[PDB]
Amino acid sequence: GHMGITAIALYDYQAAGDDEISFDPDDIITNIEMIDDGWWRGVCKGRYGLFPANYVELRQ
């Protein structure tokens, strides 16, 4: 496994810019970079970019 820090989406998010990602509830976000306290970066469904940290739940 090379998925890094992962999280499960709690809410639907639609990317609002070419540097953001989108996800639906229960999608998995992989290789998360907790780069800022509000916006994180990670990989979801083939795209890498920013998303709201509080839209996901880190996997324990």
Side-chain angles (χ1 to χ4, degrees):
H2 310 276
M3 297 302 187
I5 294 178
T6 70
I8 178 164
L10 299 175
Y11 311 105
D12 202 272
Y13 187 71
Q14 188 113 252
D18 54 33
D19 59 349
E20 299 187 2
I21 63 173
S22 301
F23 44 71
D24 308 308
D26 297 318
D27 284 343
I28 304 302
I29 303 82
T30 56
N31 282 295
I32 291 167
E33 302 166 18
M34 305 180 292
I35 64 167
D36 166 85
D37 192 65
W39 299 89
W40 291 352
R41 277 205 298 262
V43 177
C44 188
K45 301 186 302 193
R47 245 235 155 121
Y48 168 79
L50 294 160
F51 64 93
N54 64 7
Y55 271 52
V56 311
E57 179 166 0
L58 287 170
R59 293 219 56 220
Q60 301 198 0

Short mmCIF file of all heavy atoms in Angstrom, two decimals:
data_model
loop_
_atom_site.label_atom_id
_atom_site.label_comp_id
_atom_site.label_asym_id
_atom_site.label_seq_id
_atom_site.Cartn_x
_atom_site.Cartn_y
_atom_site.Cartn_z
N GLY A 1 0.80 -1.21 0.00
CA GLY A 1 0.00 0.00 0.00
C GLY A 1 0.84 1.26 0.00
O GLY A 1 1.77 1.39 0.79
N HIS A 2 0.52 2.19 -0.90
CA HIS A 2 1.22 3.47 -1.02
C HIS A 2 0.23 4.62 -1.07
O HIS A 2 0.39 5.58 -1.83
CB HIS A 2 2.14 3.45 -2.23
CG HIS A 2 3.02 2.24 -2.29
ND1 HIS A 2 4.23 2.16 -1.62
CD2 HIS A 2 2.86 1.06 -2.92
CE1 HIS A 2 4.77 0.98 -1.85
NE2 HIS A 2 3.97 0.29 -2.63
N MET A 3 -0.82 4.53 -0.26
CA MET A 3 -1.90 5.51 -0.27
C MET A 3 -1.71 6.62 0.76
O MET A 3 -2.58 7.50 0.87
CB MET A 3 -3.24 4.81 -0.03
CG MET A 3 -3.62 3.81 -1.12
SD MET A 3 -3.71 4.56 -2.76
CE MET A 3 -4.37 3.19 -3.72
N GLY A 4 -0.62 6.61 1.52
CA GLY A 4 -0.37 7.69 2.46
C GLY A 4 -1.51 7.88 3.45
O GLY A 4 -2.19 6.93 3.86
N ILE A 5 -1.70 9.13 3.86
CA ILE A 5 -2.80 9.48 4.75
C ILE A 5 -4.07 9.53 3.93
O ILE A 5 -4.13 10.21 2.90
CB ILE A 5 -2.52 10.83 5.43
CG1 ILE A 5 -1.32 10.68 6.38
CG2 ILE A 5 -3.76 11.32 6.17
CD1 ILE A 5 -0.91 11.96 7.08
N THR A 6 -5.10 8.81 4.38
CA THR A 6 -6.35 8.72 3.66
C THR A 6 -7.50 9.22 4.53
O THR A 6 -7.41 9.30 5.76
CB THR A 6 -6.66 7.29 3.19
OG1 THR A 6 -6.97 6.48 4.32
CG2 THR A 6 -5.47 6.69 2.45
N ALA A 7 -8.59 9.56 3.86
CA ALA A 7 -9.77 10.09 4.52
C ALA A 7 -10.98 9.70 3.69
O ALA A 7 -10.88 9.45 2.49
CB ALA A 7 -9.70 11.61 4.68
N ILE A 8 -12.13 9.67 4.34
CA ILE A 8 -13.39 9.39 3.67
C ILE A 8 -14.20 10.67 3.62
O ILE A 8 -14.30 11.40 4.62
CB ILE A 8 -14.16 8.25 4.36
CG1 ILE A 8 -15.50 8.02 3.65
CG2 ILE A 8 -14.38 8.56 5.83
CD1 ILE A 8 -16.16 6.70 4.00
N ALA A 9 -14.75 10.97 2.45
CA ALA A 9 -15.56 12.17 2.28
C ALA A 9 -16.86 12.04 3.05
O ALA A 9 -17.56 11.02 2.96
CB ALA A 9 -15.85 12.41 0.80
N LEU A 10 -17.19 13.08 3.80
CA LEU A 10 -18.44 13.15 4.54
C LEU A 10 -19.54 13.88 3.77
O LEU A 10 -20.72 13.57 3.96
CB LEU A 10 -18.21 13.88 5.87
CG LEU A 10 -17.22 13.22 6.82
CD1 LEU A 10 -16.98 14.09 8.05
CD2 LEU A 10 -17.70 11.84 7.22
N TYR A 11 -19.16 14.83 2.91
CA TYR A 11 -20.10 15.68 2.20
C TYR A 11 -19.63 15.84 0.76
O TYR A 11 -18.45 15.70 0.45
CB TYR A 11 -20.20 17.05 2.87
CG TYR A 11 -20.41 16.98 4.36
CD1 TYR A 11 -19.37 17.26 5.23
CD2 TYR A 11 -21.64 16.63 4.89
CE1 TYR A 11 -19.55 17.20 6.60
CE2 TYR A 11 -21.83 16.56 6.26
CZ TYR A 11 -20.78 16.84 7.11
OH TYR A 11 -20.97 16.77 8.47
N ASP A 12 -20.58 16.15 -0.11
CA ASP A 12 -20.26 16.40 -1.51
C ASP A 12 -19.51 17.71 -1.64
O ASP A 12 -19.91 18.74 -1.09
CB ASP A 12 -21.55 16.47 -2.33
CG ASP A 12 -21.32 16.20 -3.79
OD1 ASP A 12 -21.02 17.15 -4.54
OD2 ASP A 12 -21.43 15.02 -4.20
N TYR A 13 -18.40 17.69 -2.38
CA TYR A 13 -17.67 18.91 -2.71
C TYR A 13 -17.42 18.95 -4.21
O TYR A 13 -16.96 17.96 -4.79
CB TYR A 13 -16.34 19.00 -1.98
CG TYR A 13 -15.68 20.34 -2.19
CD1 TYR A 13 -16.20 21.48 -1.60
CD2 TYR A 13 -14.57 20.49 -3.02
CE1 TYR A 13 -15.63 22.72 -1.80
CE2 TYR A 13 -14.00 21.73 -3.23
CZ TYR A 13 -14.54 22.84 -2.61
OH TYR A 13 -13.98 24.09 -2.81
N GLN A 14 -17.67 20.10 -4.80
CA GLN A 14 -17.41 20.38 -6.21
C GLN A 14 -16.30 21.37 -6.35
O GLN A 14 -16.39 22.46 -5.86
CB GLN A 14 -18.65 20.96 -6.89
CG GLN A 14 -18.52 21.10 -8.40
CD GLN A 14 -19.49 20.15 -9.03
OE1 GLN A 14 -19.10 19.15 -9.57
NE2 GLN A 14 -20.80 20.40 -8.80
N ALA A 15 -15.25 20.97 -7.05
CA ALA A 15 -14.11 21.84 -7.22
C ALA A 15 -14.55 23.19 -7.77
O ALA A 15 -15.31 23.26 -8.74
CB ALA A 15 -13.11 21.19 -8.18
N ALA A 16 -14.07 24.26 -7.14
CA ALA A 16 -14.36 25.63 -7.57
C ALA A 16 -13.16 26.28 -8.24
O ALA A 16 -13.05 27.51 -8.26
CB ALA A 16 -14.84 26.46 -6.38
N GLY A 17 -12.26 25.48 -8.79
CA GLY A 17 -11.09 26.00 -9.47
C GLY A 17 -10.23 24.85 -9.94
O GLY A 17 -10.35 23.72 -9.45
N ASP A 18 -9.36 25.15 -10.90
CA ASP A 18 -8.56 24.12 -11.54
C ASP A 18 -7.51 23.52 -10.60
O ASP A 18 -6.85 22.54 -10.99
CB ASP A 18 -7.89 24.65 -12.81
CG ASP A 18 -7.09 25.92 -12.57
OD1 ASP A 18 -6.51 26.06 -11.47
OD2 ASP A 18 -7.03 26.77 -13.49
N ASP A 19 -7.34 24.06 -9.40
CA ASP A 19 -6.41 23.50 -8.42
C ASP A 19 -7.12 22.79 -7.28
O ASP A 19 -6.48 22.46 -6.27
CB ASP A 19 -5.48 24.59 -7.88
CG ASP A 19 -6.23 25.74 -7.23
OD1 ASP A 19 -7.47 25.79 -7.37
OD2 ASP A 19 -5.57 26.59 -6.59
N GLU A 20 -8.42 22.51 -7.42
CA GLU A 20 -9.22 21.83 -6.42
C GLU A 20 -9.67 20.47 -6.95
O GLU A 20 -9.61 20.19 -8.16
CB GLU A 20 -10.44 22.68 -6.03
CG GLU A 20 -10.07 24.02 -5.43
CD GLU A 20 -11.28 24.78 -4.88
OE1 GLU A 20 -12.40 24.24 -4.93
OE2 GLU A 20 -11.09 25.92 -4.39
N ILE A 21 -10.12 19.61 -6.04
CA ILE A 21 -10.68 18.31 -6.39
C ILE A 21 -12.17 18.28 -6.03
O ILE A 21 -12.69 19.16 -5.34
CB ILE A 21 -9.93 17.13 -5.73
CG1 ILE A 21 -10.02 17.20 -4.20
CG2 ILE A 21 -8.49 17.09 -6.20
CD1 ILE A 21 -9.44 15.99 -3.49
N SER A 22 -12.85 17.24 -6.51
CA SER A 22 -14.25 17.00 -6.21
C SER A 22 -14.42 15.61 -5.61
O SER A 22 -13.63 14.70 -5.90
CB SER A 22 -15.12 17.10 -7.48
OG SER A 22 -15.01 18.37 -8.09
N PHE A 23 -15.44 15.45 -4.78
CA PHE A 23 -15.77 14.14 -4.26
C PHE A 23 -17.22 14.11 -3.80
O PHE A 23 -17.83 15.14 -3.51
CB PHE A 23 -14.82 13.68 -3.14
CG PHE A 23 -14.50 14.73 -2.11
CD1 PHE A 23 -15.45 15.15 -1.19
CD2 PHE A 23 -13.24 15.26 -2.03
CE1 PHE A 23 -15.14 16.09 -0.23
CE2 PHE A 23 -12.92 16.20 -1.07
CZ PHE A 23 -13.87 16.62 -0.17
N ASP A 24 -17.75 12.90 -3.76
CA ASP A 24 -19.06 12.61 -3.23
C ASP A 24 -18.90 11.88 -1.90
O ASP A 24 -17.84 11.31 -1.63
CB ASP A 24 -19.82 11.71 -4.21
CG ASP A 24 -19.83 12.28 -5.62
OD1 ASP A 24 -20.20 13.46 -5.78
OD2 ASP A 24 -19.45 11.55 -6.56
N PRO A 25 -19.92 11.89 -1.05
CA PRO A 25 -19.80 11.18 0.23
C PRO A 25 -19.36 9.74 -0.01
O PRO A 25 -19.79 9.08 -0.96
CB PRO A 25 -21.21 11.26 0.81
CG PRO A 25 -21.75 12.52 0.24
CD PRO A 25 -21.20 12.61 -1.15
N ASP A 26 -18.46 9.27 0.85
CA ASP A 26 -17.93 7.91 0.87
C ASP A 26 -16.79 7.70 -0.14
O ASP A 26 -16.18 6.63 -0.12
CB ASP A 26 -19.00 6.82 0.68
CG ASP A 26 -20.00 6.80 1.81
OD1 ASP A 26 -19.58 6.94 2.98
OD2 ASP A 26 -21.21 6.66 1.54
N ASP A 27 -16.50 8.66 -1.01
CA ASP A 27 -15.27 8.61 -1.79
C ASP A 27 -14.07 8.67 -0.85
O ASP A 27 -14.14 9.24 0.24
CB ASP A 27 -15.19 9.79 -2.76
CG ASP A 27 -16.10 9.63 -3.96
OD1 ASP A 27 -16.56 8.51 -4.25
OD2 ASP A 27 -16.32 10.65 -4.65
N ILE A 28 -12.96 8.09 -1.29
CA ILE A 28 -11.72 8.08 -0.51
C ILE A 28 -10.75 9.08 -1.12
O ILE A 28 -10.57 9.13 -2.34
CB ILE A 28 -11.10 6.67 -0.45
CG1 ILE A 28 -12.11 5.67 0.12
CG2 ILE A 28 -9.83 6.69 0.39
CD1 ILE A 28 -12.63 6.00 1.50
N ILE A 29 -10.13 9.88 -0.26
CA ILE A 29 -9.08 10.81 -0.66
C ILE A 29 -7.77 10.23 -0.14
O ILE A 29 -7.68 9.85 1.04
CB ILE A 29 -9.32 12.22 -0.09
CG1 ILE A 29 -10.69 12.79 -0.52
CG2 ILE A 29 -8.22 13.16 -0.54
CD1 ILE A 29 -11.90 12.32 0.29
N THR A 30 -6.78 10.12 -1.02
CA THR A 30 -5.52 9.48 -0.69
C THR A 30 -4.36 10.47 -0.73
O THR A 30 -4.45 11.56 -1.30
CB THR A 30 -5.26 8.30 -1.63
OG1 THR A 30 -5.29 8.74 -2.99
CG2 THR A 30 -6.31 7.21 -1.42
N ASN A 31 -3.26 10.05 -0.11
CA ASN A 31 -2.00 10.79 -0.07
C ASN A 31 -2.22 12.25 0.30
O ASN A 31 -1.76 13.18 -0.37
CB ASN A 31 -1.21 10.60 -1.35
CG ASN A 31 -0.51 9.26 -1.37
OD1 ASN A 31 0.38 9.02 -0.56
ND2 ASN A 31 -0.95 8.36 -2.24
N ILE A 32 -2.88 12.43 1.44
CA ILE A 32 -3.27 13.75 1.89
C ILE A 32 -2.07 14.51 2.43
O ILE A 32 -1.24 13.97 3.19
CB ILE A 32 -4.39 13.64 2.92
CG1 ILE A 32 -5.66 13.14 2.24
CG2 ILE A 32 -4.65 14.99 3.61
CD1 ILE A 32 -6.75 12.71 3.18
N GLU A 33 -1.97 15.77 2.01
CA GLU A 33 -1.02 16.74 2.53
C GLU A 33 -1.86 17.72 3.33
O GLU A 33 -2.64 18.49 2.76
CB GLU A 33 -0.30 17.44 1.39
CG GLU A 33 0.46 16.48 0.48
CD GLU A 33 0.87 17.12 -0.83
OE1 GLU A 33 0.89 18.37 -0.89
OE2 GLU A 33 1.18 16.38 -1.78
N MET A 34 -1.72 17.68 4.65
CA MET A 34 -2.44 18.60 5.51
C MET A 34 -1.64 19.90 5.48
O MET A 34 -0.86 20.22 6.39
CB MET A 34 -2.60 17.99 6.91
CG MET A 34 -3.29 16.58 6.88
SD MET A 34 -3.57 15.70 8.45
CE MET A 34 -1.90 15.31 8.93
N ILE A 35 -1.81 20.66 4.38
CA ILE A 35 -0.93 21.79 4.08
C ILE A 35 -1.34 23.06 4.80
O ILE A 35 -0.51 23.98 4.96
CB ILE A 35 -0.83 22.08 2.57
CG1 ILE A 35 -2.18 22.50 1.99
CG2 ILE A 35 -0.31 20.86 1.82
CD1 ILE A 35 -2.08 23.10 0.60
N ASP A 36 -2.59 23.16 5.21
CA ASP A 36 -3.12 24.35 5.85
C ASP A 36 -4.19 23.86 6.80
O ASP A 36 -4.63 22.71 6.71
CB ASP A 36 -3.68 25.31 4.79
CG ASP A 36 -4.54 26.42 5.38
OD1 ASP A 36 -3.98 27.45 5.80
OD2 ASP A 36 -5.78 26.27 5.39
N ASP A 37 -4.59 24.71 7.74
CA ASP A 37 -5.56 24.25 8.72
C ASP A 37 -6.96 24.12 8.15
O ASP A 37 -7.76 23.35 8.69
CB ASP A 37 -5.57 25.15 9.96
CG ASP A 37 -6.34 24.54 11.12
OD1 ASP A 37 -5.90 23.48 11.63
OD2 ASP A 37 -7.37 25.10 11.51
N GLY A 38 -7.27 24.83 7.06
CA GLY A 38 -8.59 24.77 6.46
C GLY A 38 -8.67 24.01 5.16
O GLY A 38 -9.68 23.36 4.87
N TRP A 39 -7.63 24.10 4.34
CA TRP A 39 -7.60 23.46 3.03
C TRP A 39 -6.47 22.44 2.99
O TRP A 39 -5.32 22.76 3.33
CB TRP A 39 -7.40 24.49 1.93
CG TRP A 39 -8.49 25.50 1.87
CD1 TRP A 39 -8.55 26.68 2.56
CD2 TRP A 39 -9.70 25.42 1.11
NE1 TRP A 39 -9.72 27.34 2.26
CE2 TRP A 39 -10.44 26.59 1.37
CE3 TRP A 39 -10.23 24.48 0.22
CZ2 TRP A 39 -11.68 26.84 0.79
CZ3 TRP A 39 -11.46 24.73 -0.36
CH2 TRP A 39 -12.17 25.90 -0.07
N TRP A 40 -6.79 21.22 2.61
CA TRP A 40 -5.80 20.18 2.43
C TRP A 40 -5.66 19.88 0.95
O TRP A 40 -6.49 20.29 0.13
CB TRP A 40 -6.24 18.92 3.18
CG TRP A 40 -6.20 19.04 4.69
CD1 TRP A 40 -5.70 20.07 5.42
CD2 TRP A 40 -6.68 18.07 5.63
NE1 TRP A 40 -5.82 19.80 6.76
CE2 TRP A 40 -6.43 18.58 6.91
CE3 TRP A 40 -7.29 16.82 5.50
CZ2 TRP A 40 -6.77 17.89 8.07
CZ3 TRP A 40 -7.64 16.13 6.66
CH2 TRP A 40 -7.37 16.67 7.93
N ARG A 41 -4.60 19.16 0.61
CA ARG A 41 -4.39 18.66 -0.75
C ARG A 41 -4.34 17.15 -0.72
O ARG A 41 -3.85 16.55 0.23
CB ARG A 41 -3.08 19.17 -1.35
CG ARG A 41 -3.16 20.56 -1.94
CD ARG A 41 -2.07 20.72 -3.00
NE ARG A 41 -0.74 20.57 -2.43
CZ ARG A 41 0.05 21.58 -2.07
NH1 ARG A 41 -0.34 22.84 -2.22
NH2 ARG A 41 1.25 21.33 -1.56
N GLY A 42 -4.87 16.53 -1.77
CA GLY A 42 -4.84 15.09 -1.86
C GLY A 42 -5.32 14.63 -3.22
O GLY A 42 -5.60 15.44 -4.11
N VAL A 43 -5.39 13.31 -3.37
CA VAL A 43 -5.75 12.66 -4.62
C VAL A 43 -7.13 12.05 -4.45
O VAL A 43 -7.39 11.30 -3.50
CB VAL A 43 -4.72 11.57 -4.99
CG1 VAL A 43 -5.15 10.86 -6.26
CG2 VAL A 43 -3.33 12.17 -5.14
N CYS A 44 -8.01 12.33 -5.41
CA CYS A 44 -9.32 11.70 -5.40
C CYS A 44 -9.78 11.53 -6.84
O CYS A 44 -9.79 12.50 -7.60
CB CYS A 44 -10.33 12.54 -4.62
SG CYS A 44 -11.91 11.72 -4.36
N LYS A 45 -10.12 10.30 -7.20
CA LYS A 45 -10.66 9.97 -8.51
C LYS A 45 -9.82 10.58 -9.64
O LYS A 45 -10.34 11.18 -10.59
CB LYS A 45 -12.14 10.35 -8.59
CG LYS A 45 -12.97 9.60 -7.54
CD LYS A 45 -14.46 9.83 -7.66
CE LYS A 45 -14.83 11.29 -7.58
NZ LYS A 45 -16.30 11.47 -7.38
N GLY A 46 -8.51 10.40 -9.55
CA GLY A 46 -7.62 10.73 -10.63
C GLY A 46 -7.14 12.17 -10.67
O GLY A 46 -6.41 12.53 -11.61
N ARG A 47 -7.53 12.99 -9.71
CA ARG A 47 -7.14 14.40 -9.65
C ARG A 47 -6.43 14.71 -8.33
O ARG A 47 -6.75 14.16 -7.34
CB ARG A 47 -8.37 15.30 -9.72
CG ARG A 47 -8.52 16.21 -10.95
CD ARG A 47 -8.71 17.75 -10.93
NE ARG A 47 -8.16 18.06 -12.23
CZ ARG A 47 -8.77 18.67 -13.25
NH1 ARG A 47 -9.95 19.25 -13.12
NH2 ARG A 47 -8.14 18.75 -14.41
N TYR A 48 -5.46 15.60 -8.38
CA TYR A 48 -4.71 16.05 -7.22
C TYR A 48 -4.98 17.53 -7.02
O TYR A 48 -4.87 18.31 -7.97
CB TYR A 48 -3.22 15.81 -7.46
CG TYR A 48 -2.29 16.47 -6.48
CD1 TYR A 48 -2.06 15.91 -5.22
CD2 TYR A 48 -1.61 17.62 -6.82
CE1 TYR A 48 -1.19 16.51 -4.33
CE2 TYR A 48 -0.74 18.22 -5.93
CZ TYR A 48 -0.53 17.66 -4.70
OH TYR A 48 0.34 18.28 -3.83
N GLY A 49 -5.33 17.92 -5.80
CA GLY A 49 -5.60 19.31 -5.54
C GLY A 49 -6.24 19.52 -4.19
O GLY A 49 -6.33 18.62 -3.36
N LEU A 50 -6.73 20.75 -4.01
CA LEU A 50 -7.19 21.27 -2.74
C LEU A 50 -8.64 20.91 -2.46
O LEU A 50 -9.46 20.79 -3.38
CB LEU A 50 -7.09 22.80 -2.75
CG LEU A 50 -5.68 23.40 -2.81
CD1 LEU A 50 -5.75 24.83 -3.31
CD2 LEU A 50 -5.03 23.34 -1.45
N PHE A 51 -8.97 20.80 -1.18
CA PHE A 51 -10.33 20.51 -0.74
C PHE A 51 -10.48 20.95 0.71
O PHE A 51 -9.48 21.08 1.43
CB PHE A 51 -10.65 19.02 -0.89
CG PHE A 51 -9.82 18.13 -0.02
CD1 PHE A 51 -10.26 17.75 1.24
CD2 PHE A 51 -8.60 17.64 -0.46
CE1 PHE A 51 -9.49 16.92 2.04
CE2 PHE A 51 -7.82 16.81 0.34
CZ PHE A 51 -8.27 16.43 1.58
N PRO A 52 -11.71 21.14 1.18
CA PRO A 52 -11.91 21.57 2.57
C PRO A 52 -11.66 20.43 3.55
O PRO A 52 -12.26 19.36 3.45
CB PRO A 52 -13.38 22.02 2.61
CG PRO A 52 -13.94 21.81 1.26
CD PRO A 52 -12.98 21.02 0.44
N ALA A 53 -10.77 20.68 4.52
CA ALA A 53 -10.39 19.63 5.46
C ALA A 53 -11.60 19.10 6.22
O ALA A 53 -11.69 17.89 6.48
CB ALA A 53 -9.35 20.15 6.44
N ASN A 54 -12.54 19.98 6.60
CA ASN A 54 -13.66 19.55 7.42
C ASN A 54 -14.76 18.85 6.61
O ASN A 54 -15.80 18.48 7.18
CB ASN A 54 -14.20 20.69 8.30
CG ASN A 54 -14.78 21.85 7.51
OD1 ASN A 54 -14.91 21.81 6.29
ND2 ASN A 54 -15.14 22.90 8.23
N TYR A 55 -14.55 18.61 5.32
CA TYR A 55 -15.45 17.78 4.53
C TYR A 55 -15.09 16.30 4.59
O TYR A 55 -15.83 15.48 4.03
CB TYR A 55 -15.43 18.22 3.07
CG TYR A 55 -16.43 19.29 2.69
CD1 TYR A 55 -16.52 20.49 3.40
CD2 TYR A 55 -17.27 19.12 1.60
CE1 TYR A 55 -17.43 21.47 3.02
CE2 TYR A 55 -18.17 20.08 1.22
CZ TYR A 55 -18.26 21.26 1.93
OH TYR A 55 -19.17 22.21 1.51
N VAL A 56 -13.99 15.92 5.26
CA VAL A 56 -13.52 14.55 5.28
C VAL A 56 -13.24 14.10 6.71
O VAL A 56 -13.07 14.91 7.62
CB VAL A 56 -12.27 14.33 4.39
CG1 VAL A 56 -12.50 14.94 3.02
CG2 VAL A 56 -11.02 14.90 5.04
N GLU A 57 -13.15 12.79 6.88
CA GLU A 57 -12.82 12.17 8.14
C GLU A 57 -11.56 11.32 7.91
O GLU A 57 -11.60 10.38 7.16
CB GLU A 57 -13.98 11.33 8.67
CG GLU A 57 -13.62 10.66 9.98
CD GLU A 57 -14.78 10.08 10.74
OE1 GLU A 57 -15.90 10.18 10.27
OE2 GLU A 57 -14.52 9.53 11.82
N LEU A 58 -10.48 11.68 8.59
CA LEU A 58 -9.25 10.90 8.49
C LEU A 58 -9.49 9.48 8.96
O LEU A 58 -10.19 9.24 9.95
CB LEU A 58 -8.16 11.52 9.37
CG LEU A 58 -7.54 12.82 8.88
CD1 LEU A 58 -6.68 13.41 9.99
CD2 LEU A 58 -6.72 12.59 7.62
N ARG A 59 -8.90 8.53 8.24
CA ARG A 59 -8.98 7.12 8.60
C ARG A 59 -7.98 6.80 9.69
O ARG A 59 -6.82 7.21 9.62
CB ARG A 59 -8.70 6.28 7.36
CG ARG A 59 -9.78 6.41 6.29
CD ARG A 59 -10.05 5.07 5.65
NE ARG A 59 -10.41 4.11 6.68
CZ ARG A 59 -10.01 2.85 6.72
NH1 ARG A 59 -9.23 2.35 5.77
NH2 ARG A 59 -10.40 2.08 7.72
N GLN A 60 -8.43 6.06 10.70
CA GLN A 60 -7.60 5.72 11.85
C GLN A 60 -6.99 4.33 11.69
O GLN A 60 -7.53 3.48 10.98
CB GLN A 60 -8.42 5.79 13.13
CG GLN A 60 -9.02 7.16 13.40
CD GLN A 60 -9.45 7.35 14.84
OE1 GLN A 60 -9.29 6.45 15.67
NE2 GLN A 60 -9.99 8.52 15.15
#
